[PDB]
Structure of beta-lactamase:
Amino acid sequence: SDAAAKQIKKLEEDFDGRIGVFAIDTGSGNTFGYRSDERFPLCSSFKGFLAAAVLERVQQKKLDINQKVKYESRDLEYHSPITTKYKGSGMTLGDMASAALQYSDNGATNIIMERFLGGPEGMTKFMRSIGDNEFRLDRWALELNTAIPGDKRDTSTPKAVANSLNKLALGNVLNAKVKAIYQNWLKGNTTGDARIRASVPADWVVGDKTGSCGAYGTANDYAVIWPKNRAPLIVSIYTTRKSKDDKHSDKTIAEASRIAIQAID
Ligand SMILES: *C(=O)[C@@H]([C@@H]1NC(C(=O)[O-])=C(SC2Cn3cnc[n+]3C2)[C@@H]1C)[C@@H](C)O
Ligand SMILES: [Cl-]
């Protein structure tokens, strides 16, 4: 079968947009990229890094994983499936951060950015602190999802996402028990079954976080993959289209992931 360079180019032509890819075989250090340094909108995918930042703070004894977070007076954001359920009782910080990741919960994300992580600019400073110079969060969860062509707000690159996921999930930034907790959160993500997970054999373990801006066909997924009997892989796939009414494509993301996994092997 064809080199990845040919398959990814034809896929991108079919998709009528742009596809950005970076994948890492962590057992060799081999990498595959296409548009890997190009900015793409994060959409909700930054929430998986917000969850990791909460766990970094817990490891440092800067937050309590079990502190109760109450929000009985909040007007909860659209797409807050878990915080909606707990509005009367509150949630622990850890459970709220888990929901920000696994359900893309907007209320969980914005409450944690308002109270603990210093807003979009605080989230951005956390990413700088771990050596990610590309990520930028300019707006709040939900608010950020405009995906306008040419707009640099709320972007990163496929490579910086992959490198940051590697750092956060595989033992660089998260050093204590919180590393396994973060891996568990990623593994239980609920929104990615049609994306990178669809490209991976079922007897490999995967954790991921998605994003779907809902405009300009813009959507993404990143994943840590634990194959049987080999070191982890990291896969980061980001997409855009040029007309506001274009829809995103799960099958394009899964395909780009298949191509990337073949390339790094
Ligand atoms: C984040 O990108 C988005 C929210 N997060 C997710 C998600 O990652 O599943 C949903 S996107 C929704 C529309 N769509 C297309 N394919 C899958 N999905 C799920 C919500 C809305 C922003 C708006 O917070
Ligand atoms: Cl969002």
